[PDB]
Amino acid sequence: TMIEDPEAGHFHTSSA
């Protein structure tokens, strides 16, 4: 599961 970063165009992995 990925979550969209507040900074558009970037993503990070969910902690859950």
Q: Which residues contact 16 (CB under 8 A, 6 or more apart)?
A: 1
Tokens 């970063």 identify what position? 5
Chain length of the chain: 16
> Where does residue 9 fall: left (phi above 0), alpha (psi -120 to 50 degrees), or beta otherwise?
left
Tokens 């970037």 identify what position? 10
Structure determined by: NMR
